[PDB]
Amino acid sequence: ATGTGLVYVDAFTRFHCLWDASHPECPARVSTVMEMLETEGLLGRCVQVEARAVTEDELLLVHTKEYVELMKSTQNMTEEELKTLAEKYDSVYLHPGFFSSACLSVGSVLQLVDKVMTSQLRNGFSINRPPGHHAQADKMNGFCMFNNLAIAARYAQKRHRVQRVLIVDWDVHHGQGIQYIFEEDPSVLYFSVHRYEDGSFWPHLKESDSSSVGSGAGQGYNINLPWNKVGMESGDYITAFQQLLLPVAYEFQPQLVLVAAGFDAVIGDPLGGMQVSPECFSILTHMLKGVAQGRLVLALEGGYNLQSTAEGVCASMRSLLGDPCPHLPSSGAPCESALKSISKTISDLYPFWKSLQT
Ligand SMILES: CN(C)Cc1ccc(S(=O)(=O)n2ccc(/C=C/C(=O)NO)c2)cc1
Ligand SMILES: [K+]
Ligand SMILES: [K+]
Ligand SMILES: [Zn+2]
């Protein structure tokens, strides 16, 4: 009843890049996380929750039938056919076990949502791969096949009659797939903090700027915080959460919080270029527990330094378990660049949120 759920299955390690032995999205990502959770004594304090395969109908909450059929067919393809198809998308690989593992990756999040919404667990973390936040209605993208958290949000709405879901994406990349799926939807609030650099950082989209606030019925319910300098630190994230994200979150009154919990913003990541201490994520996780009765589910997205990502997961897990907020190595003030970005996003979202009108 008062526990923290954890999902991990060996299938999460049974796919990898056949044609690039050094691809950063690899099985060692999750096995290293699991090893550190054990050596830190955190794994044994969690409630083990079994994974399950997403159903076709659940995938169709977000993805097209044509795309689901195509992805289902990759389990029977030759390596040459997998490479030919993978190259039709931006930055993906395929593997005979990718579809099977991707279905368990979605399902792991749904399993935690079930436990949390029925008050059987307080919160949970899925240690899943492949990641999801770049996947789109009809295409793979950015190492992702299915959009784990977008499916989970719509599942929570359909299965548990949740009205409002908050998705917080602290991966260093913009989860444009999530943004696109919910762009016109005021019932799912999407917040992303990400490296941008005027579009020079992948995925190079103007829609990743803070001027993209949602459209149609969804205006105000998409919040982008783009960083335009590398080297951001814990203080930059803490400031953004205290004065932008959490004021909006309390005004929105979500009934479930889903976190796209990537750790490629952590110190040492080979792709992210940021300097956030892993301990920062204990603090960010604590803040999110005050909303939605603490009904909080984290799911692994990116993070490609094996040690840094494990440390980030552990720091988040200590907070889910209710351990004391840890002292931070560098509790410095935010930098000028971060403050410019935060001010501009606040400016763009001001008309929609009373809690930002200060
Ligand atoms: C093939 N070798 C060189 C690895 C590689 C390095 C860089 C790029 S990239 O810059 O084009 N790119 C595309 C997607 C992402 C991020 C994914 C993510 O982490 N989401 O969380 C980054 C692609 C591939
Ligand atoms: K992000
Ligand atoms: K939205
Ligand atoms: Zn990422």
Q: Is 296 left (phi over 0), alpha (psi -120 to 50) or beta?
A: beta
Reduced to 3 states, what is the DSSP secondary structure of residue 5?
strand
**Residue 274 near residue 236 (C-beta atoms within 8 A):** no
**CB within 8 A of 230, min separation 6: which ones?**
195, 197, 273, 274
Structural domains of the chain sorted by starting position, each given as residue range(s) with its CATH number in brackets: 1-358 (3.40.800.20)
**Residue 130 near residue 102 (C-beta atoms within 8 A):** yes
Reduced to 3 states, what is the DSSP secondary structure of residue 259?
strand
Which residues pair with residue 192 across a beta bridge?
A: 169, 224
**Residue 133 near residue 175 (C-beta atoms within 8 A):** yes
The Cα–Cα gap between 130 and 101 comes to 7
Q: Report the amino acid identity of residue 288.
A: L
* Inter-CA distances, 70 with 14, 74, 131, 139, Å: 20, 7, 19, 10
Q: Is 294 left (phi over 0), alpha (psi -120 to 50) or beta?
A: left
Residue 142 CA, closest ligand 1 atom number: 14
- Supply the DSSP string of 276-307, one letter for each residue: B-TTHHHHHHHHHTTSGGG-EEEEE-----HH
Which residue out of 202, 264, 301, 304 has the highest number of ligand 1 atoms within 8 Å of its CB and is therefore the one to mutate? 202
Which residues pair with residue 223 across a beta bridge?
A: 191
CA nearest neighbour of 321 among 4, 62, 39: 4
Residue 287 tokens, joined = 């803040």
Residue 225 tokens, joined = 């915080």
Residue 264 CA, closest ligand 1 atom number: 19
Ligand nearest to the CA of 245: 2
77: phi then psi, degrees, rounded to nearest 5:
-85, 150
Q: Distance between the two ends of the chain, CA-based, in angstroms?
A: 39
The Cα–Cα gap between 296 and 281 comes to 14
Which residue out of 83, 171, 271, 301 has the highest number of ligand 1 atoms within 8 Å of its CB and is therefore the one to mutate? 271
Nearby residues for ligand 2 (ion, Cβ within 5 Å): 169, 171, 192, 194
The Cα–Cα gap between 277 and 19 comes to 33
* Inter-CA distances, 234 with 197, 265, 267, 331, Å: 19, 10, 10, 7
Residue 206 tokens, joined = 């103007």
Could you tell me where the DSSP H helices lie in 233-352? 234-240, 246-252, 280-288, 306-320, 336-349
**Ligand 1 contacts CB of residue 132 (under 6 A):** no
Residue 255 tokens, joined = 């009934």
What is the distance of C-alpha 187 from the center of its chain?
Answer: 18
Ligand nearest to the CA of 142: 1
**Residue 154 near residue 59 (C-beta atoms within 8 A):** no
Whether 171 has a binding-site annotation, put simply, is yes
Q: Is 165 left (phi over 0), alpha (psi -120 to 50) or beta?
A: beta
Q: Where are the beta strands (DSSP E) in 19-65?
A: 47-48
Strand order in the sheet with 256-261: 47-48, 4-7, 123-126, 296-300, 256-261, 165-169, 188-195, 222-227
The Cα–Cα gap between 226 and 131 comes to 21
Q: Is 18 exposed, middle or buried (0-12, 13-18, 19+ CB in 10 A)?
A: middle
Residue 113 tokens, joined = 């949502």
The Cα–Cα gap between 155 and 309 comes to 28
**Residue 220 near residue 349 (C-beta atoms within 8 A):** yes
What is the rounded radius of gyration, in angstroms, for the C-alpha atoms of the chain?
Answer: 19
**Ligand 1 contacts CB of residue 302 (under 6 A):** yes
Residue 172 CA, closest ligand 1 atom number: 21
Q: At what angle do helices 98-117 and 65-73 cross, to 10 degrees?
A: 130
Q: Is 85 exposed, middle or buried (0-12, 13-18, 19+ CB in 10 A)?
A: middle
Residue 250 tokens, joined = 């309390």
The Cα–Cα gap between 204 and 303 comes to 19
Reduced to 3 states, what is the DSSP secondary structure of residue 239?
helix
The Cα–Cα gap between 62 and 109 comes to 15
Q: Where are the beta strands (DSSP E) in 77-215?
A: 123-126, 165-169, 188-195
Separation of 232 CA from ligand 1 center, angstroms?
Answer: 19
**Ligand 1 contacts CB of residue 295 (under 6 A):** no
**Ligand 1 contacts CB of residue 15 (under 6 A):** no
CA nearest neighbour of 342 among 248, 206, 279, 278: 248
CA-nearest residue for atom 15, ligand 1, is: 142
**CB within 8 A of 323, min separation 6: which ones?**
282
Separation of 227 CA from ligand 4 center, angstroms?
Answer: 14
Q: How many helices (H) and strands (E) does the chain have?
A: 12, 8
Active centre residues (catalytic)? 134
The Cα–Cα gap between 179 and 203 comes to 13
- Supply the DSSP string of 194-221, one letter for each residue: EE-GGGTSTT--GGGSTT----GGGTTS
The Cα–Cα gap between 250 and 43 comes to 31
CA angle 266, 269, 272 (to 5 degrees): 80
CA nearest neighbour of 312 among 40, 115, 112: 40
**Ligand 1 contacts CB of residue 17 (under 6 A):** no
51: phi then psi, degrees, rounded to nearest 5:
-75, 165
**Residue 188 near residue 214 (C-beta atoms within 8 A):** no
The Cα–Cα gap between 153 and 58 comes to 11
**Ligand 1 contacts CB of residue 334 (under 6 A):** no
Beta pairing, strands 188-195 & 222-227: parallel
Classify residue 253 by its DSSP letter: -
Q: At what angle do helices 280-288 and 306-320 cross, to 10 degrees?
A: 40
**Ligand 1 contacts CB of residue 142 (under 6 A):** yes
Residue 134 CA, closest ligand 1 atom number: 20
Separation of 213 CA from ligand 3 center, angstroms?
Answer: 8
The Cα–Cα gap between 330 and 26 comes to 31
CA-nearest residue for atom 18, ligand 1, is: 302
**Ligand 1 contacts CB of residue 169 (under 6 A):** no
Whether 348 has a binding-site annotation, put simply, is no
The Cα–Cα gap between 53 and 268 comes to 33
